[PDB]
Design a protein around this ligand. Sequence first.
Ligand SMILES: N[C@@H](CCC(=O)O)C(=O)O
Ligand SMILES: N[C@@H](CCC(=O)O)C(=O)O
Ligand SMILES: [Cl-]
Lengths: 250, 248
Amino acid sequence: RSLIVTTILEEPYVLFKKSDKPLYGNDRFEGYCIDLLRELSTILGFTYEIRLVEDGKYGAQDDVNGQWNGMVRELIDHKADLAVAPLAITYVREKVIDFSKPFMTLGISILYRKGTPIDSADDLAKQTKIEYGAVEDGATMTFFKKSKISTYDKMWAFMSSRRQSVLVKSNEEGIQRVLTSDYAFLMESTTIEFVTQRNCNLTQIGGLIDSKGYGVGTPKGSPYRDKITIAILQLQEEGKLHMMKEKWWR
Amino acid sequence: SLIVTTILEEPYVLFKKSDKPLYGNDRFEGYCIDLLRELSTILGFTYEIRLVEDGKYGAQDDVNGQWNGMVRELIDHKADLAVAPLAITYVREKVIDFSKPFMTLGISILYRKGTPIDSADDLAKQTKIEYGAVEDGATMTFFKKSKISTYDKMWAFMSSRRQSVLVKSNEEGIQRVLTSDYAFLMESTTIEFVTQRNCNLTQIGGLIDSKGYGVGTPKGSPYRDKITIAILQLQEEGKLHMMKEKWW
Ligand SMILES: N[C@@H](CCC(=O)O)C(=O)O
Ligand SMILES: N[C@@H](CCC(=O)O)C(=O)O
Ligand SMILES: [Cl-]
């Protein structure tokens, strides 16, 4: 049977392809992760059906009831066979689902405007005039929520107390906030690179705050995890992932 | 106790300097030894460090399929873990298991400053400046297998001059860059260490590829996923970053 592949809209990894005519099935989608999925299928010999995650979330565990949401929950429940998306490999996720080895490496950083006095997370933490936030229920939010580092702990205190006003539903919403208000957005460096190649007034501020990879997610125990790792290693070595990066980040 | 295979390579693993003779695990220090210590704390194992007898990382013989180096030790179940700057590669992942990466890197070029050489392509299209890599490591294996024109050409050069331009260790390659007209293909993490200590040397060009170092285990080992979890803990705690800062 075809594998069910959960994913999420996120430029330039996954987007709706443009056409003057209606599009159907997998042909509706394009992006770096869609190219990745196609190449994985070429190597491993599977067929697949792409399905956008219904709640539009990456995945986090609820504080109170300990339930997961997003693509992570879809894998846990065996509603999908793979998640092919910019899904960060994290400690808490690795406890409940499996991941291939990373196809891309990245870290949290800051998206803000050029020409300002802000040069680091510490600069943001030490003030309140410039608001800042992150995507709700993603790995970046979770990093701040759990950090014992003073600077990041202070930042979580600020974001948490202003949740409704500074946390956003999507990277797109965050980027828009940066473009239209005095706001700095905590987000992943890979995605910042895409944004700053298109928006010449924006820049990454400071360096990477952490390091992590994106991996293909599978339900815990899936035999596809190790096969997908081997295929990713092949695509990396052949230079195909690099060409895909160049294609989509232009 | 676990048997841990490793290899001498600054600043990942080195012999501690000391006045008094050292024994057993006390003999060793470095980034990978700190990593091993952190992993043993999280997972609750004790261990014996043993340097790989043949001094090799691991490659497969093109004729008879035999492996050497730390990879061989894992295949033969002579070691439980390999904790070293051991690159996760396609060919190795088919025969051993690896944790997720504790460090990310890529092949690049080590050479002297002040020249017009700016890329692998610049090296490939000439012969005056010789170039090479560590024998029986991941970098050599990348070139050997590459379908990319420039890299295929570089493999043709290197293999035809194997006895002169391929070296036994990074240390030997670095000395060769310092004493002759030679550019060394080597891993970017190690280049960073070298260029922070040798102001006449520099990385040429960017990364030629992308890979990680992982803890190796025999195929099917229960330790692989446990070590991955521990590495993720260490990354998220900020310890992997502090470990790199310490040794670099
Ligand atoms: N890629 C992230 C979502 C975006 C973010 O948290 O910055 C994740 O896997 O949760
Ligand atoms: N770290 C490499 C050895 C050095 C190199 O090939 O540049 C390996 O795992 O084989
Ligand atoms: Cl893995």
